[PDB]
Enzyme design. Structure first.
Site, PDB file in Angstrom:
ATOM      1  N   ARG A 181      -2.478  11.282   6.652  1.00  0.00           N
ATOM      2  CA  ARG A 181      -2.807   9.961   7.120  1.00  0.00           C
ATOM      3  C   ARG A 181      -2.158   8.903   6.255  1.00  0.00           C
ATOM      4  NH1 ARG A 181      -7.611   6.962   4.642  1.00  0.00           N
ATOM      5  NH2 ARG A 181      -7.510   4.997   5.821  1.00  0.00           N
TER       6      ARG A 181
ATOM      7  N   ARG B 267      -0.049   9.582  -0.096  1.00  0.00           N
ATOM      8  CA  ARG B 267      -1.093  10.170  -0.922  1.00  0.00           C
ATOM      9  C   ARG B 267      -0.996  11.689  -1.072  1.00  0.00           C
ATOM     10  NH1 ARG B 267      -5.287   5.856  -0.149  1.00  0.00           N
ATOM     11  NH2 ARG B 267      -5.479   5.355   2.073  1.00  0.00           N
TER      12      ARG B 267
ATOM     13  N   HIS C 142     -10.996  13.193   0.700  1.00  0.00           N
ATOM     14  CA  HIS C 142     -11.198  11.793   1.073  1.00  0.00           C
ATOM     15  C   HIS C 142     -11.391  11.550   2.560  1.00  0.00           C
ATOM     16  CE1 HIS C 142     -10.737   7.472   1.207  1.00  0.00           C
ATOM     17  NE2 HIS C 142      -9.535   7.555   1.753  1.00  0.00           N
TER      18      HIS C 142
ATOM     19  N   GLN D 236      -7.172  15.260   3.718  1.00  0.00           N
ATOM     20  CA  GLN D 236      -6.532  14.389   2.757  1.00  0.00           C
ATOM     21  C   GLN D 236      -7.310  14.406   1.434  1.00  0.00           C
ATOM     22  OE1 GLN D 236      -5.241   9.674   2.873  1.00  0.00           O
ATOM     23  NE2 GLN D 236      -4.176  11.371   3.919  1.00  0.00           N
TER      24      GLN D 236
ATOM     25  N   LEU E  27     -14.298   6.102  -5.201  1.00  0.00           N
ATOM     26  CA  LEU E  27     -12.918   5.790  -4.992  1.00  0.00           C
ATOM     27  C   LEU E  27     -12.475   4.525  -5.743  1.00  0.00           C
ATOM     28  CD1 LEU E  27     -10.552   6.633  -3.298  1.00  0.00           C
ATOM     29  CD2 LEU E  27     -11.282   4.948  -1.671  1.00  0.00           C
TER      30      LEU E  27
ATOM     31  N   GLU F 270      -6.256   2.444  -3.608  1.00  0.00           N
ATOM     32  CA  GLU F 270      -4.796   2.476  -3.671  1.00  0.00           C
ATOM     33  C   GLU F 270      -4.252   1.079  -3.861  1.00  0.00           C
ATOM     34  OE1 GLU F 270      -2.296   3.776   0.040  1.00  0.00           O
ATOM     35  OE2 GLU F 270      -2.603   5.636  -1.085  1.00  0.00           O
TER      36      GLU F 270
ATOM     37  N   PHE G  64       0.860  -1.160   0.000  1.00  0.00           N
ATOM     38  CA  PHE G  64       0.000   0.000   0.000  1.00  0.00           C
ATOM     39  C   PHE G  64       0.908   1.225   0.000  1.00  0.00           C
ATOM     40  CE2 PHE G  64      -4.449  -0.581   0.163  1.00  0.00           C
ATOM     41  CZ  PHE G  64      -5.100   0.522   0.754  1.00  0.00           C
TER      42      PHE G  64
ATOM     43  N   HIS H 151      -7.595  12.044  -1.949  1.00  0.00           N
ATOM     44  CA  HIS H 151      -7.203  10.711  -2.369  1.00  0.00           C
ATOM     45  C   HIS H 151      -6.851  10.743  -3.859  1.00  0.00           C
ATOM     46  CE1 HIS H 151      -7.313   6.474  -3.380  1.00  0.00           C
ATOM     47  NE2 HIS H 151      -7.335   6.163  -2.097  1.00  0.00           N
TER      48      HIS H 151
HETATM   49  C1  LIG Z   1     -14.523   7.109   2.078  1.00  0.00           C
HETATM   50  C2  LIG Z   1     -13.592   5.967   2.250  1.00  0.00           C
HETATM   51  C3  LIG Z   1     -12.848   5.834   3.422  1.00  0.00           C
HETATM   52  C4  LIG Z   1     -11.943   4.772   3.529  1.00  0.00           C
HETATM   53  C5  LIG Z   1     -11.834   3.877   2.477  1.00  0.00           C
HETATM   54  C6  LIG Z   1     -12.595   4.006   1.333  1.00  0.00           C
HETATM   55  C7  LIG Z   1     -13.479   5.055   1.216  1.00  0.00           C
HETATM   56  C8  LIG Z   1     -14.297   5.175  -0.028  1.00  0.00           C
HETATM   57  N1  LIG Z   1     -10.994   2.807   2.554  1.00  0.00           N
HETATM   58  C9  LIG Z   1     -10.231   2.612   3.669  1.00  0.00           C
HETATM   59  C10 LIG Z   1      -9.376   1.526   3.704  1.00  0.00           C
HETATM   60  O1  LIG Z   1      -9.312   0.752   2.750  1.00  0.00           O
HETATM   61  N2  LIG Z   1      -8.604   1.321   4.810  1.00  0.00           N
HETATM   62  C11 LIG Z   1      -8.696   2.207   5.856  1.00  0.00           C
HETATM   63  O2  LIG Z   1      -7.988   2.018   6.833  1.00  0.00           O
HETATM   64  N3  LIG Z   1      -9.547   3.297   5.842  1.00  0.00           N
HETATM   65  C12 LIG Z   1     -10.308   3.503   4.724  1.00  0.00           C
HETATM   66  N4  LIG Z   1     -11.152   4.584   4.656  1.00  0.00           N
HETATM   67  C13 LIG Z   1     -11.242   5.506   5.841  1.00  0.00           C
HETATM   68  C14 LIG Z   1     -12.130   4.793   6.869  1.00  0.00           C
HETATM   69  O3  LIG Z   1     -12.852   3.799   6.191  1.00  0.00           O
HETATM   70  C15 LIG Z   1     -13.249   5.607   7.514  1.00  0.00           C
HETATM   71  O4  LIG Z   1     -12.788   6.827   8.025  1.00  0.00           O
HETATM   72  C16 LIG Z   1     -13.893   4.753   8.610  1.00  0.00           C
HETATM   73  O5  LIG Z   1     -15.253   4.700   8.282  1.00  0.00           O
HETATM   74  C17 LIG Z   1     -13.818   5.244  10.046  1.00  0.00           C
HETATM   75  O6  LIG Z   1     -14.951   4.722  10.714  1.00  0.00           O
HETATM   76  P1  LIG Z   1     -16.008   5.698  11.456  1.00  0.00           P
HETATM   77  O7  LIG Z   1     -16.911   4.878  12.350  1.00  0.00           O
HETATM   78  O8  LIG Z   1     -15.374   6.806  12.266  1.00  0.00           O
HETATM   79  O9  LIG Z   1     -16.816   6.390  10.275  1.00  0.00           O
HETATM   80  P2  LIG Z   1     -18.265   5.875   9.916  1.00  0.00           P
HETATM   81  O10 LIG Z   1     -18.343   4.384   9.980  1.00  0.00           O
HETATM   82  O11 LIG Z   1     -18.649   6.430   8.578  1.00  0.00           O
HETATM   83  O12 LIG Z   1     -19.166   6.568  11.028  1.00  0.00           O
HETATM   84  C18 LIG Z   1     -20.524   6.731  10.760  1.00  0.00           C
HETATM   85  C19 LIG Z   1     -21.310   6.346  11.988  1.00  0.00           C
HETATM   86  O13 LIG Z   1     -21.565   7.497  12.779  1.00  0.00           O
HETATM   87  C20 LIG Z   1     -22.951   7.770  12.777  1.00  0.00           C
HETATM   88  N5  LIG Z   1     -23.447   9.142  12.763  1.00  0.00           N
HETATM   89  C21 LIG Z   1     -23.018  10.158  11.975  1.00  0.00           C
HETATM   90  N6  LIG Z   1     -23.757  11.251  12.255  1.00  0.00           N
HETATM   91  C22 LIG Z   1     -24.670  10.924  13.177  1.00  0.00           C
HETATM   92  C23 LIG Z   1     -25.653  11.672  13.786  1.00  0.00           C
HETATM   93  N7  LIG Z   1     -25.865  12.919  13.373  1.00  0.00           N
HETATM   94  N8  LIG Z   1     -26.463  11.064  14.725  1.00  0.00           N
HETATM   95  C24 LIG Z   1     -26.291   9.726  15.048  1.00  0.00           C
HETATM   96  N9  LIG Z   1     -25.298   8.996  14.425  1.00  0.00           N
HETATM   97  C25 LIG Z   1     -24.499   9.595  13.504  1.00  0.00           C
HETATM   98  C26 LIG Z   1     -23.338   7.272  11.423  1.00  0.00           C
HETATM   99  O14 LIG Z   1     -24.740   7.394  11.255  1.00  0.00           O
HETATM  100  C27 LIG Z   1     -22.655   5.904  11.468  1.00  0.00           C
HETATM  101  O15 LIG Z   1     -23.210   4.925  12.339  1.00  0.00           O
HETATM  102  O1  LIG Z   2      -7.100   3.214  -1.278  1.00  0.00           O
HETATM  103  C1  LIG Z   2      -8.116   3.004  -0.597  1.00  0.00           C
HETATM  104  O2  LIG Z   2      -8.901   2.032  -0.709  1.00  0.00           O
HETATM  105  C2  LIG Z   2      -8.393   3.952   0.455  1.00  0.00           C
HETATM  106  C3  LIG Z   2      -7.805   3.606   1.563  1.00  0.00           C
HETATM  107  C4  LIG Z   2      -8.028   4.457   2.705  1.00  0.00           C
HETATM  108  O3  LIG Z   2      -8.906   5.351   2.663  1.00  0.00           O
HETATM  109  O4  LIG Z   2      -7.319   4.192   3.683  1.00  0.00           O
END
Ligand SMILES: *Cc1cc2c(cc1C)nc1c(=O)[nH]c(=O)nc-1n2C[C@H](O)[C@H](O)[C@H](O)COP(=O)(O)OP(=O)(O)OC[C@H]1O[C@@H](n2cnc3c(N)ncnc32)[C@H](O)[C@@H]1O
Ligand SMILES: O=C(O)/C=C/C(=O)O
Ligand SMILES: C/C=C/CC/C=C/CC/C=C/CCCCCCC(=O)OC[C@H](COP(=O)(O)OCCN)OC(=O)CCCCCCC/C=C/C/C=C/CCC
Ligand code: HEM
Ligand SMILES: CC(C)Oc1cccc(NC(=O)c2ccccc2C(F)(F)F)c1
Ligand code: SF4
Ligand code: F3S
Ligand code: FES
Lengths: 613, 249, 153, 129
Positions: free
Chosen positions: A400, A288, A355, A242, A254, A257, A121, A244
């Site tokens: 990150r 990135r 991102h 960040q 997306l 990577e 990665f 992406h």
């Molecule tokens: C966008 C993205 C991010 C990503 C990724 C690919 C994409 C397209 N791929 C990753 C990867 O391969 N490896 C990695 O380590 N990270 C990767 N990322 C980043 C990472 O996935 C995210 O940042 C991750 O989701 C972090 O988890 P987190 O729990 O903090 O974020 P979430 O699951 O999206 O949280 C949403 C939860 O919170 C609740 N929420 C939000 N607002 C409210 C309100 N207003 N009231 C009540 N609950 C709320 C959501 O509803 C949900 O339950």
């Molecule tokens: O390249 C990806 O899938 C994104 C990874 C991440 O958000 O950590």
């Protein structure tokens, strides 16, 4: 008008059920607490499920590896803006964290021998920066975030924690520096709820929707960080947004990577791997923040591709259909669906997209929310925790590292659990609500409901997102930001000319539109000013007019005999924005970066160096 | 300039003596995204903000935006708008779901059913949690292909008349899909007692092999195949056991 | 007796009817497809035949109007040969289709050939196949009822 | 005002708290196994009747044809005839009318191959008209 209000009393409440949310949820349930999980969609719908690449961990199922080299890269990629303790925490805990998920039954892809499969990665490297590229990411082919999130949800039932689903968290319950619970709205029937709780976790993901283009969900408005602000908490590192490298040109989907990690590379109009120029060592696998610039340059200089000369190609057709179908199933699809492209025949149109947010709510290695003064350091706000993306431990600092976030949501979630099962007095009981408490959150709602403004909920959102893209972009100049902050501050003023249409309580989408704006003003405005005030160029952050990274020393030349620059002259510091919500007025303290490990005897800290890839 | 028109189901639950209906929307295909969802989003922003549905990912993977479009159950976010504007496309919520508002079905019974099948690993020899991996070879995890991918959209389930008629007593394809998912995992030990929980007349045997389930799965998955395999295990043919975790693991 | 979940399901429907919530449109709006229509026709044929055999045994017993007499209080009504010859086809087609399509539905019941293309060939292979057997059962005797409306020598 | 009620935790299913007192391993699998074998083996039968008529035919066709239909309609009834729509006391009544249907049938079929032409013949006659 009038409203129905309901009272709940729980030990702990968790706001949001993402990966971080669930990993907590199950830690406490498991040790027997009366949890409550509040979220605004069925947990499997959280942005975590779009995660693709993987999760970093040194199991070395491919070649011997040490958790130490992973710590190295984490601090490196962080451009020394992270707290080195958090990074320490993260990285020794990472081997357990992952395997825990294989024991919970995650269908990780597999090595012939029989152990977890691993891929390479962006940003990572063996032997403290002097080996080959590390294969440290564990993955369910391409569906890694999805597979994981179901697994956690699956296990979240095995331990009895009451899910309040399709509930919108309005605000925190504040008792002068003490968090007692949360206020929330129940979509399904319009009833307001209050949650007495001993403890409270905010785990609500990033604010990627502040921009026009992003790889994020429609649901990712960072309402967590809105809650801290309206609770009078200082937010930090909101300028580290960040971008992406391989967003999909048209839509903003997306392309992991992991596709570069597996071989496929970048190409400009000339038909050339331009990464050999910008990163002679890592090539298409630099960090990135670097790679994203490389593209943003290439385009600026007319080597861009298409009929618009304004994106570039990601190329994978030189690879076996076998490896492609098997190691990258999902992207093969989305390519075909949105781009109308076959990864065996052609390249994919790609373009840097907003991102992740390494910013968020300030915490220690113990994941507890903290206020801060020069006067007496950092006073922990008791009752309150945060993890995941809405969090800022600063395991990321300025940039990150990739696939360290699912990690930091598993690990600091899991830390949320262990570090409450550690300090909860099974003696004293549940906090009381003050009289007439919560009443101001609902008051907002009311006027936002019957809001007879003259600019519509949707037109506003758009304009701000356009103005964020233009200004808080990849490359930021001085007079752009200042002109940005100008407009932006008119907008956080436009919120009293607000037009709404659906007056109904039940599943009022126009209204969770509006709350989710309010909560992104406070994000964007703080994001932009903090950006403007920074006069340096580190990680996600780049200035046209300040190309150099300002530290205490000047680590380009050997240290011996240089003079330490004073704390106010340099920029190795966390930016801490406050805003009063009534006014919407931002004022900025500055916290010192934490440079010490947790066990000097187990591992030695890493002193700032020149950032070479 | 080319104008598409859409027929969309509508129900205002808070309104007195409430009735469902079809409402009509004209949309400028020149000023619009390629997908159905896109078009929906346009008219909340530009004609009608009361129009309510579920959405998150936009990349076809969250599972939220599930519905019936021109007669088929599928994901709005990955549904190409019918270019030909002579024909009017028509959008309805997942069939025979109880509706809360507009395109927003009550998903709860579905969810429960998901839960009841115990969607987590369980072992007779209880294990140290943070310690070493469990052996599973590549041949054995490939077995889980087309199974772990289900995004729980409920498309298939809402498309099965069996399930319409007896949602309550019959688990439905989405859920049995997943039941099988766990029974055939070479690291699960509950395989025998998992089948125990559905031996009755209505839990899995109320599949009439209509096949609608497979034809409809936006994710190109195969529920019936699964169901088929379950009925077998419920009678004749058997589950395999593990190959032994090799020495030096 | 009901598994614990089935019980939950019940109360759910009680709850949901308790709130006078509407059911989302289904047969009225769902799209005509070969999956469900075949399956449908399979019941129909199934029940057509059983319905026949009911009003059969039962009719002719509870009635003083036996078969033989019926068979010709229809033959004695100037009925053109084709019209009679699709009435046979009609009767032959149920039995043809329910049987072939029947065997198909056993495969499915054993996860054999349960994938869209293999599903779709079957459905045609058998819809056409029955239509064939059916037709030869009707028309071939009708051929030998003309091949003997003129024996050569 | 925040002078309002203390409510409860919204209806949820807990799959582990449910596993308490509930195991009755009563498996319809085996029955299902055989009703599928039945039709399976009843295949070579149906074409045999086009080939071979006579009086032992009529009667075992009838025999088999009853069993299949019995089972079959039981299945039909548990589909279309169900409590939510019918109310419980009437849904029992249809579950009974199922067995009335087997009897009305077999007794009616028995009659036919005794005091009328037979089945094999009833077809023969309709083909020659
Ligand atoms: C966008 C993205 C991010 C990503 C990724 C690919 C994409 C397209 N791929 C990753 C990867 O391969 N490896 C990695 O380590 N990270 C990767 N990322 C980043 C990472 O996935 C995210 O940042 C991750 O989701 C972090 O988890 P987190 O729990 O903090 O974020 P979430 O699951 O999206 O949280 C949403 C939860 O919170 C609740 N929420 C939000 N607002 C409210 C309100 N207003 N009231 C009540 N609950 C709320 C959501 O509803 C949900 O339950
Ligand atoms: O390249 C990806 O899938 C994104 C990874 C991440 O958000 O950590
Ligand atoms: C709407 C109507 C719905 C149906 C109502 C009918 C009642 C159904 C009873 C079902 C029992 C079927 C058996 C009939 C039978 O064998 O007749 C023989 C007769 C001999 O006559 P005949 O005119 O005297 O002919 C004498 C032959 N030499 O046959 C015929 O004339 C009709 C032919 C029956 C169809 C053939 C079935 C083929 C099965 C598919 C094959 C595949 C296996 C692999
Ligand atoms: C050997 C020949 C036959 C085979 C292989 C066969 C096969 C089947 C099968 C597999 C079913 C189960 C439907 C399901 O639950 O998916 C069925 C149902 C049924 N069969 Fe047959 N059948 C045959 C002959 C007949 C005949 C001749 C009749 C009528 C006299 C008949 C009447 C019915 C009825 C009434 C059903 C009701 C269930 C339903 O339609 O779903 N069967 N048949
Ligand atoms: C319009 C389509 C999608 O749907 C129609 C609606 C009405 C009933 C049916 N068809 C069945 O209902 C049917 C057919 C064969 C076996 C089992 C069933 C059963 F069990 F009842 F689901 C078909
Ligand atoms: S099998 Fe397909 S249609 Fe069914 S819930 Fe899963 S993703 Fe949806
Ligand atoms: S539509 Fe229903 S009948 Fe079985 S084949 Fe699918 S679950
Ligand atoms: S909204 Fe994610 S599946 Fe369409």
């Amino acid at each position: 008008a009038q409203y129905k209000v309901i009272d709940h009393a729980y030990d702990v409440v968790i706001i949001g059920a993402g990966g971080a949310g669930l990993r907590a949820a199950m830690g406490l349930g498991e040790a027997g607490f009366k949890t409550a999980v509040v979220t605004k969609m069925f947990p499997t719908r959280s942005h975590t499920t779009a995660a693709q690449g993987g999760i970093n961990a040194a199991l070395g199922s491919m070649n011997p590896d040490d958790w130490k080299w992973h710590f190295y890269d984490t601090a490196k990629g962080s451009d020394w803006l992270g707290d080195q303790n958090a990074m320490h925490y993260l990285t020794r805990n990472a081997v357990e964290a992952v395997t825990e998920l294989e024991n919970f039954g995650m269908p990780f892809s597999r090595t012939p021998e029989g152990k977890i499969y691993q891929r390479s990665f962006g940003g990572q490297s063996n032997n403290y920066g002097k080996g080959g590229v590390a294969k440290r990411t564990c993955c369910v082919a391409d569906r890694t975030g999805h597979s994981m999130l179901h697994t956690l949800y699956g296990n979240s039932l095995r331990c009895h924690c009451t899910f309040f689903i399709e509930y919108f968290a309005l605000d925190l319950l504040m008792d002068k520096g003490r968090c007692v619970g949360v206020i929330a709205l129940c979509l399904e029937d319009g009833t307001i709820h209050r949650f007495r709780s001993k403890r409270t976790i905010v785990a609500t993901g990033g604010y990627g929707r502040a921009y026009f283009s992003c790889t994020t969900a429609h649901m990712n408005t960072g309402d967590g960080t809105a809650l801290a602000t309206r609770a009078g908490i200082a937010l930090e590192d909101l300028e580290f947004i960040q971008f992406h490298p391989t967003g999909i040109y048209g839509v903003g989907c997306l392309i992991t990577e992991g596709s570069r990690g597996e071989g496929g590379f970048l190409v400009n109009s000339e038909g050339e791997r331009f990464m050999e120029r910008y990163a002679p060592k890592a090539k298409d696998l630099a960090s990135r923040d670097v790679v994203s610039r490389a593209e943003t340059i290439e385009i600026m200089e007319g080597r861009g591709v298409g009929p618009e000369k304004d994106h570039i190609y990601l190329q994978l057709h030189h690879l076996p259909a076998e490896q492609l179908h098997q190691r990258l199933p999902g992207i093969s699809e989305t390519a075909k669906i949105f781009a109308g492209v076959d990864v065996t025949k052609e390249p994919i149109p790609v373009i840097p997209t907003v991102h992740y947010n390494m910013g968020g709510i300030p915490t220690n290695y113990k994941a507890q929310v903290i206020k801060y003064t020069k006067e007496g350091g950092d006073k922990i706000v008791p009752g309150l925790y945060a993890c995941g993306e809405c969090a800022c431990h600063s395991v990321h600092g300025a940039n990150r590292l990739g696939a360290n976030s699912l990690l930091d949501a598993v690990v600091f979630g899991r830390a949320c659990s262990i570090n409450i099962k550690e300090e909860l007095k099974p003696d004293e009981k549940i906090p009381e609500l003050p009289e007439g408490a919560g009443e101001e959150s609902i008051a907002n709602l009311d006027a936002v409901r019957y809001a007879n403004g003259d600019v519509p909920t949707a037109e506003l959102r758009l304009t701000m997102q356009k103005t964020m893209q233009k200004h808080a972009g990849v490359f930021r100049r001085g007079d752009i930001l200042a002109e940005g902050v100008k407009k932006m501050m008119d907008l956080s003023k436009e919120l009293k000319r607000l037009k709404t249409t659906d007056r109904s309580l039940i599943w009022n989408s126009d209204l969770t539109e509006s709350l989710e704006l309010q909560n992104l003003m406070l994000n964007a405005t703080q994001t932009i000013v903090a950006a403007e005030n920074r006069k340096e160029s580190r990680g996600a952050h780049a200035r046209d007019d300040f190309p150099k990274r300002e530290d205490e020393y000047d680590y380009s030349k050997p240290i011996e005999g240089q003079t330490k620059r004073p704390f106010e002259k340099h920029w190795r510091k966390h930016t801490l924005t406050k805003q009063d919500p009534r006014t919407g007025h931002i004022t900025l303290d500055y916290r010192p970066v934490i440079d010490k490990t947790l066990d000097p005897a187990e591992v030695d800290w890493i002193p700032p160096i020149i950032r070479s890839y | 300039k080319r104008i598409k028109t859409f027929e969309i189901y509508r129900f205002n639950p808070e309104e007195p003596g409430a009735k469902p209906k079809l409402q009509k929307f004209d949309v400028d295909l020149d000023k619009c995204g390629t997908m159905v969802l896109d078009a929906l989003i346009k008219i909340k922003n530009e004609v009608d903000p009361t129009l309510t549905f579920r959405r998150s990912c936009r990349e076809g993977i969250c599972g939220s935006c599930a519905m019936n479009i021109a007669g088929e159950n599928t994901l709005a976010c990955i549904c190409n708008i019918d270019q030909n504007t002579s024909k009017t496309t028509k959008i309805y919520p997942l069939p025979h779901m109880f509706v809360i508002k507009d395109l927003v079905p009550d998903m709860n019974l579905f969810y429960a059913q998901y839960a009841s099948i115990q969607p987590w690993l369980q072992k007779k020899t209880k294990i140290n949690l943070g310690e070493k991996q469990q052996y599973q070879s590549i041949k054995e995890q490939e077995k889980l292909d087309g199974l772990y991918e289900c995004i729980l959209c409920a498309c298939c389930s809402a498309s099965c008349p069996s399930y319409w008629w007896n949602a309550d007593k019959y688990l439905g394809p989405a859920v049995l899909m997943q039941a099988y998912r766990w029974i055939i995992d070479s690291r699960d030990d509950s395989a025998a007692e998992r089948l125990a929980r559905m031996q009755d007349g209505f839990s899995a045997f109320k599949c009439h092999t209509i096949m609608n389930c497979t034809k409809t799965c936006p994710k190109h998955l195969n529920p019936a195949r699964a169901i088929g395999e379950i009925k077998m295990l419920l009678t004749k043919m058997k589950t395999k056991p593990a190959p032994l975790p090799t020495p030096a693991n | 007796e009901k598994t614990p979940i089935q019980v939950w399901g019940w109360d759910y429907l009680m709850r949901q009817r308790a709130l006078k919530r509407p059911i989302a449109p289904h047969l009225t709006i769902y799209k005509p497809q070969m999956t469900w229509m075949v399956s449908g026709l399979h019941r129909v044929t199934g029940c057509a035949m059983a319905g026949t055999l009911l009003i059969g045994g039962v009719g002719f017993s509870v009635l003083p109007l036996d078969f033989t007499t019926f068979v010709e209080f229809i033959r004695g009504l100037g009925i053109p040969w084709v019209i009679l010859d699709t009435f046979k086809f009609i009767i032959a087609f149920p039995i043809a289709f329910h049987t072939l399509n029947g065997i198909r539905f056993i495969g499915f019941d054993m996860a054999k050939g349960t994938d869209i293309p293999s599903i779709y060939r079957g459905a045609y292979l058998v819809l056409g196949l029955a239509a064939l057997i059916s037709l030869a059962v009707v028309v071939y005797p009708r051929w030998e009822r003309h091949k003997k409306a003129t024996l050569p020598t | 005002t925040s002078a309002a009620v203390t409510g409860a935790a919204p209806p949820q299913f807990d799959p582990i708290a449910a596993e308490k007192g509930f195991k009755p391993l009563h498996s319809h699998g085996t029955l299902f196994k055989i009703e599928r074998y039945f039709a399976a083996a009843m295949v070579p039968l149906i074409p045999a009747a086009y080939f071979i008529h006579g009086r032992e035919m009529d009667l075992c066709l009838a025999l088999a044809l009853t069993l299949h239909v019995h089972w079959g309609v039981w299945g039909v009834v548990n589909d279309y005839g169900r409590p939510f729509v019918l109310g419980d006391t009437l849904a029992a009544a249809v579950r009974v009318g199922a067995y009335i249907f087997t009897a009305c049938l077999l007794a009616g079929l028995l009659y036919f191959n005794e005091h009328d032409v037979g089945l094999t013949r009833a077809f023969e006659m309709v083909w020659e008209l």
